[PDB]
Amino acid sequence: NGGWYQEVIIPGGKDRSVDGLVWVTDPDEEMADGKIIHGKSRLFSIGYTTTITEWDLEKARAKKHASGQHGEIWCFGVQPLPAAQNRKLVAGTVDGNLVLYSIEDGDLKFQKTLTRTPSKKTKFVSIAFQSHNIVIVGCSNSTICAYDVRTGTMLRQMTLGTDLTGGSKNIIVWAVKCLPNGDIVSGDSTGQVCIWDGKTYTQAQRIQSHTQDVLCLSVSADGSKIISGGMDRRTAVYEPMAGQSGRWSKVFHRRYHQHDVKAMASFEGKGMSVVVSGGSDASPIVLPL
Amino acid sequence: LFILTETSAGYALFKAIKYKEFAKFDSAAIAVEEASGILEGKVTPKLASLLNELKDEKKVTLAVHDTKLSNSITKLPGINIKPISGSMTDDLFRAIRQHLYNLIPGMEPSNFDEMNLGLAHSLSRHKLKFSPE
Amino acid sequence: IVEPHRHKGVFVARGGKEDLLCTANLVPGESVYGEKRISVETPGSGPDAVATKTEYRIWNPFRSKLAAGILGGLETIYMKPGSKVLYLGAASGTSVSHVADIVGPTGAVYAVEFSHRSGRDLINMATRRTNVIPIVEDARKPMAYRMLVPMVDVIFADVAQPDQARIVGINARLFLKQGGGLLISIKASCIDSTAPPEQVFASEVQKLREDKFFPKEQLTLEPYERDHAMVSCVYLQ
Amino acid sequence: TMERFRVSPCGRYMALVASDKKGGGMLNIINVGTMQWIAQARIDGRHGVADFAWWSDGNGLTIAGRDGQVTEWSMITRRTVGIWRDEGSIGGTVMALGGRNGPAELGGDRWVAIGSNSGILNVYDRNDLIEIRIKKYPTPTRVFEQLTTSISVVAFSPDGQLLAFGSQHKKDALRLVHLPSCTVYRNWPTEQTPLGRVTAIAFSSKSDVLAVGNDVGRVRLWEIRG
Amino acid sequence: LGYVRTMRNIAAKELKELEERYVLAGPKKIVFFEGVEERQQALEKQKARRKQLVLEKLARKVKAARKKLKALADAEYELELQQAKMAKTATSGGFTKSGRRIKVRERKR
Amino acid sequence: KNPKDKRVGSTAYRVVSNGGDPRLAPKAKKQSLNLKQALLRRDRVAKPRGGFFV
Amino acid sequence: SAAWPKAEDPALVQELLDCVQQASHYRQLKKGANETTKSVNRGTSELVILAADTQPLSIVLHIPLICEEKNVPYVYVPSKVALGRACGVSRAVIAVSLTSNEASDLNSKIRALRDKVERLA
RNA sequence: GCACCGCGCGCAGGGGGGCCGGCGCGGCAUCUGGGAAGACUCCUAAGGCGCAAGGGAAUACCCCGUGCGCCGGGGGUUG
């Protein structure tokens, strides 16, 4: 409740990094008498390898490893709740193939591969789920693909243009996330933030916000605020424009960090709405949301 | 510790290390009905004649490695003892079939694999008519 | 002239310009899929000079995965006449007939093939040779033929699925003996068609090794096929 | 560039295709009276935007890109109404949009005509796109395969009774089509009708005069009389 | 064209049979070990003209059969280009004798 | 690390190696870590690093 | 259904139909189910593209058997009309088969395209 | 083994290192060259291409104006 006490540090070895972190929290189970068993929360990570690691916070070391024959995993996420005991991780990678791992009953194993891109030069850099069965992935070849997890099919390939600010024509969608009403918010290599329609999968807005590329996004739990953190050490806050629906605009920006803002995540509960942004200056900055 | 073993012919039970009892069968076209009855987990006469004791449940245990068969024979009220699923029970149901040469002088002093072959042919041709030609 | 090879149950036929592989036909006077066969007698019949007793079916390594391993330098094949081999991926009864002729009448080969047309030709082959039993079931579901298959000695595995090591893993946890044998044929263009095949094969060997096999050897099938490996390994010993 | 544009029929807006292909084309929409940017409509394709057409009431516009994706994009909600696909188009070249008494929420134009690079021009009744949901695979009212080279021009009559579509790359490759019957007129053009290599066509405001201008630089005029 | 197609089918069957016979006549193998000790023990255990003529003969037969199949395949391709050059309408395919490649972009109506 | 393989000329004898990662973490691929940086610094150059120093 | 190596990605479908159009201009293409079957049986065929919009789908299902016997890659595009006017036919073509030769930029495109089809499989 | 009043040299090879310099394989945001390339673009010109004969030669290469065809330019009023 505003104390921010650092409890445990579990260090990895030499030549070992951590790129993505995902908690998997089960829903509230109920006993025979009306007592509440809360969700057991398991921590998964990737380390710029082909291996998803599950961490044991009780023993303060790594619990499990899973790996399939594919490239290095660059982004992953846990499928949201609509099933109940059958939840699955979806992981994008370098060479393209969206691998899909299974987690149930204390297990982490490489289940299958949904699809892969035709072009071998498509690298998957960010992933976010719109619903239980629709996965929105950003790619390096200027696309935001929207796959469907059950059959593994492809709903639509959203695209973005060249960057006309410098060279290097391929834009890179560094962070996608999904609003609660269905829209998709995506920060990319131009420092833009695009608002994509949820039903049609076309863009509805381009908001030029940053100068260098937007590296991480965060979306409020009720869908009212968007926080964008870029490589120009800049954090920008957007609220919807009054009147027309689906139109966002940048309320204000400020440079909170001293290097780029590589990751941030939000929390809103028990009288505490924060968003914690960690960058490359090792200082996690907590903003009130 | 009642274990439930299903071969192509019959069943065995090793509750007290060493084998305790059995149930034998041979050479009928109701063997494929037994086969479908454990493809689902339905009522089975060999199953019921095995699990029918007269006293009570004396300790609620029946070790069957497939969870589907376990929670389909949980629902039968004929004996109301509740079974257990495969709690990584590899050692039991692997060692009994590797050391099943010890069992063969007990219930069927013979080689019963010809009806295993016949049931395999019957099931495979049943599925080849399920994909009809 | 016919000699037996180093592998028991496998024969070679030698001539002035050729060297062919062959097996001892369990049903003499009968061929299966259009294969050449040689009649040889045991010596002691000079006045008659009729090739009466032994009929040998020529094993074709261009249609067999296992026969491409034996001519490649497979040190053991883990099976002798009288063993028990589970054949995973029996495509229309091509190699499983030669495996049945290797294991003989006191051996038995359990063929598993999910695909229905190859199941049709497999059962129409398997009617004659009685030492095979065919199972038309998905190899990714071993509890559907757990009643039908007893404990085996060798698992042969030629199935074109990306979770080939997982299929081998569940079938070996349910059917292979302690200290058993596994001969698996790995297809790189089936598992990952973009990585180097050495890397694909090394990842499959590592998956078996964490799946509690012991990789003894690996050899490529590359005068005969393209980007195919054969891993010969033992189970728990 | 500012080469390709379309002014709205109400005269208030004007859309310009932005020269940025990269697997999907956008077009910037400009208020006519003040000459300022007011919107932008982006579609996904392979080479961008083949053509587009404003709706008849003047709000939205239908953007037919290359590789067959056609997109109805409204001006009121300022996002995409829907996306459908031309039937079997390996790549679109031109589109036109005309008639009256169409669907009320899709601009009120009845017919859309999309001509591909093979030579085939499909004509769809726009009351068949509504399944606001658009069918992802509508069927054409009529597929015209009379011209063999890529369809370069297409133009509806302003009262929505004629449709003239022509290819530039053949001498005298122009056809004239009745609507709603979708039948090619067989009596004109004949073997000796001096069309030339047709580069632009234009129907009159009362639709009494067809003007055809070729690659030599000669306009010729034809009274339409029914 | 029909005659060249039948001769190409016969010659392709001959090439397949001859290449099978040549392979049957004449970092490949990897053996794994648990440790350097077992690897060195196996290395201790490793420390403990007719075919040339007939394989050169089969190799010359294989090269002549490949030349024959390549010649018949080039003949069949040249005859398909002759069909394209003599079609009743303008069809793409083939080079002119000036060198410029024929390509018509009309559709077959 | 791992002992390098020894080739007789036809076959290759190699020690298996998985003794690097017991329970700790898998070692990050330096080729993939430098690729994500090269997507972050595309054509852009660094500013001069420190103060007055050779 | 029975069209399991389906090409669903529109970028890959556009690449397949562009290579079909280039082979059609090179006269390196066999159009139709019977001509496709003849090219696959004779073994001159490098890649084979079937269409999944066939109204009885079972009239092109024999070609996967011959391609499994001859080890050539087959792939399914969505629309047979698109395949037809990609070849330049003005009819609906349900199966097409594009062949190989000695040395071509088209042959390099064929090798890359069957690599992409093997990525689908 | 050579010098038993010496360093060192000729040679077998056991392991690890400087991972210094090359080679091979793989990815590589861009940049450079080539091919293909959009059909508004180029398509060599008001003409050209093909097939089959005929005639001549630097005799491997080619050139020229008869019979069938395929386009193109120009001209061109609901045939």
Short mmCIF file of C-alpha atoms in Angstrom, two decimals, chain F:
data_model
loop_
_atom_site.label_atom_id
_atom_site.label_comp_id
_atom_site.label_asym_id
_atom_site.label_seq_id
_atom_site.Cartn_x
_atom_site.Cartn_y
_atom_site.Cartn_z
CA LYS F 1 32.95 -25.70 -21.89
CA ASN F 2 32.44 -28.86 -23.94
CA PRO F 3 35.30 -31.03 -25.18
CA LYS F 4 35.69 -30.69 -28.93
CA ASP F 5 34.85 -33.71 -31.07
CA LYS F 6 37.46 -36.10 -32.43
CA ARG F 7 36.99 -37.32 -36.01
CA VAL F 8 38.65 -40.51 -37.21
CA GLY F 9 37.96 -39.38 -40.77
CA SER F 10 34.64 -41.13 -41.28
CA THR F 11 32.82 -41.01 -37.94
CA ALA F 12 32.82 -38.40 -35.18
CA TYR F 13 33.07 -39.40 -31.53
CA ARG F 14 31.71 -36.73 -29.21
CA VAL F 15 31.03 -36.36 -25.51
CA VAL F 16 27.46 -35.37 -24.74
CA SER F 17 27.21 -32.05 -22.95
CA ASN F 18 24.35 -30.79 -20.81
CA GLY F 19 26.32 -30.15 -17.64
CA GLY F 20 26.26 -26.38 -18.08
CA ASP F 21 22.74 -25.56 -16.88
CA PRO F 22 21.72 -27.53 -13.77
CA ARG F 23 18.84 -25.51 -12.30
CA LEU F 24 20.08 -21.93 -12.66
CA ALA F 25 18.98 -20.35 -16.01
CA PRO F 26 19.76 -20.94 -19.70
CA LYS F 27 22.58 -18.85 -21.12
CA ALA F 28 21.46 -16.00 -23.37
CA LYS F 29 22.20 -16.21 -27.09
CA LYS F 30 24.62 -13.40 -27.90
CA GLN F 31 23.58 -13.45 -31.56
CA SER F 32 19.95 -12.77 -30.68
CA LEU F 33 20.73 -10.17 -28.01
CA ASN F 34 22.82 -8.18 -30.49
CA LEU F 35 20.08 -8.44 -33.11
CA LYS F 36 17.47 -6.71 -30.94
CA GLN F 37 19.99 -3.95 -30.28
CA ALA F 38 20.62 -3.59 -34.02
CA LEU F 39 16.90 -3.06 -34.49
CA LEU F 40 17.11 -0.36 -31.81
CA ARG F 41 20.15 1.51 -33.19
CA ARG F 42 19.41 1.35 -36.88
CA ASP F 43 21.56 4.06 -38.51
CA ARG F 44 21.97 6.28 -35.46
CA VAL F 45 25.35 6.89 -33.84
CA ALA F 46 26.30 7.27 -30.20
CA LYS F 47 26.94 10.59 -28.59
CA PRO F 48 30.52 11.09 -27.30
CA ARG F 49 30.76 9.03 -24.13
CA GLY F 50 32.54 10.75 -21.27
CA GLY F 51 34.37 13.89 -20.31
CA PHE F 52 37.97 14.92 -20.91
CA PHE F 53 39.76 11.63 -21.53
CA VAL F 54 41.78 9.88 -24.23
#
